[PDB]
Design a protein around this ligand. Structure first.
Ligand SMILES: CC1(C)CCN(Cc2ccc(N3CCOC4(CCN(c5cc(NCc6ccccc6)ncn5)CC4)C3)cn2)CC1
Lengths: 241, 198
């Protein structure tokens, strides 16, 4: 059965026919939940904001710039590439960059290298169209988005499959947070261009559309002061008193 | 000439100028990540003579996700799409930091192709895994619908890869099998004794 031919025949994307898409992961999810910091968040216009005010340096950065391709204030790859992400990333740290499906797959890699990362995974968000069976440069209908994982310094699969969201819904699948958190990469987690709707325990969310803020740099740093400076986010809290 | 054609050769050394021009090139290189090519040998492949206007399909994994983009650009292409093949078993279930459920194929464009059927297919293939390193046959159908009837060339193919409208190059093909008279003629003057060396 050729699902490419089938898509040509019917309009049902081949990913509509992927099926089913040890346990133990539930305990790990529970440890993550126990060690998570309180959600912290800050309304900031990132184009005018000195991101060096965001301290301390982060173990994980999730970067979700609002690309114009998402709509059919937008950020171009010119804008994104000029963010000084290297100035707030910890010497050993990770980045997850939503790159879209067009020139971002190239320019996002330039960004990763510019900020000092090397790409170690390419996570594809594959969009089904079970419910509703073109870029001038495009050769094919684009039915997926890429989130690039980068590393600097010294149970999941690289696919997320959900239905294509309604028009104008720009949210990314919350499953990306699950993948990131299951890596147990450390506890200082920054989500740039997040929204009220993406605020989450264990994350600092910074973005222009946030309606409220609670970020205080000293309070935030106090979550990671000794004896908690090196926890992975997947281990029990350290007994106080 | 419509039926399958092929040349057993070392792609590093074949004079590919004898083959003419192609609407589509596909390559599944043995990236240095049996025999492989070094990064320099890949860069030096004479891909630029194979097309004037058309598309290149380039399979990549691991750090060839980046090296393949470098070669694509060096050879004169712009990457304009990226196909992913979701690998399933016979029951449509998906088979370092993450498990890998897919393989990637970069799509490059050179010049200004006219008369291709862009947008008929989507950029996700769902198809069963077969032998080690065997790409899914769906890609030939997508390419045929994109560019029906035109001349195509596959680099680093194996015997199961030979297809009508395609010329297949690779060093585990069985001899030389050419039927297009223009290609036969140019092959004979360039290789009068049938030996492809140096
Ligand atoms: C799963 C998918 C979609 C597919 C698999 N890809 C990875 C991949 C790609 C390719 C292979 N191949 C297997 C073997 O044969 C081939 C083809 C013929 N071939 C040569 C080489 C040569 N010159 C150099 C040379 C060097 C040393 C000695 C002599 C010559 N010239 C001509 N043909 C060697 C390669 C193909 C295997 N896996 C991932 C994505």
């Amino acid at each position: 059965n050729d699902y490419c031919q089938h898509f040509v025949d019917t309009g049902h994307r081949p990913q509509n026919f992927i099926r089913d898409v040890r346990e133990l992961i539930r305990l790990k999810d529970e440890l993550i939940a126990k060690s998570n910091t309180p959600p912290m968040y800050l309304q900031a216009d990132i184009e005018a904001f000195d991101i060096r005010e965001l301290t301390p340096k982060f173990d994980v950065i999730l970067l979700e710039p609002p690309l114009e391709e998402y709509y059919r204030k937008c950020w171009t790859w010119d804008d994104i590439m000029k963010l000084e992400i290297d100035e707030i990333a910890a010497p050993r740290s990770f980045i997850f960059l939503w790159c879209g499906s067009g020139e971002g797959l190239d320019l996002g890699r330039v960004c990763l290298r510019k900020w000092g990362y090397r790409r170690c995974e390419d996570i594809c968000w594959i969009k089904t169209n079970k419910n509703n069976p073109l870029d001038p440069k495009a050769v094919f209908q684009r039915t997926k988005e890429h989130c690039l994982m980068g590393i600097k310094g010294t149970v999941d699969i690289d696919l997320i499959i959900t239905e294509e969201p309604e028009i104008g819904n720009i949210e990314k699948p919350v499953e990306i947070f699950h993948i990131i958190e299951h890596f147990c990469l450390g506890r200082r987690r920054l989500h740039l261009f997040g929204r009220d709707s993406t605020i989450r325990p264990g994350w600092l969310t910074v973005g222009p559309t946030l309606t409220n803020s609670n970020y205080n740099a000293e309070t935030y740093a106090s979550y990671f002061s000794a004896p908690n400076s090196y926890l992975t986010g997947c281990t029990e809290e350290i007994e106080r008193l | 000439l419509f039926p399958p054609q092929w040349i057993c050769c070392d792609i590093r050394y074949l004079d590919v100028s004898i083959l003419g021009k192609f609407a589509v090139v596909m390559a599944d290189p043995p990236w240095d990540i049996y025999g492989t090519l070094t990064d320099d040998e890949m860069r030096r492949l004479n891909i630029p003579v194979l097309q004037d206007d058309g598309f290149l399909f380039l399979w990549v994994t691991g750090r060839a996700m980046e090296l393949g983009r470098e070669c694509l650009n060096l050879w004169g292409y712009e990457r304009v799409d990226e196909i992913i093949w979701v690998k399933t078993n016979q029951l449509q279930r998906i088979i370092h930091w993450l498990n890998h459920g897919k393989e990637h194929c970069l799509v490059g464009v050179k010049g200004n192709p006219q008369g291709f059927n862009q947008g008929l297919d989507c950029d996700v293939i769902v198809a069963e895994v077969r032998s080690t390193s065997h790409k899914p046959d769906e890609i030939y159908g997508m390419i045929e619908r994109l560019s029906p009837g035109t001349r195509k060339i596959e680099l680093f193919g194996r015997p199961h890869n030979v297809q009508p409208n395609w010329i297949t190059l690779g060093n585990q093909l069985d001899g030389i099998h050419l039927l297009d008279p223009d290609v036969v003629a140019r092959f004979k003057q360039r290789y009068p004794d049938g030996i492809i060396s140096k």
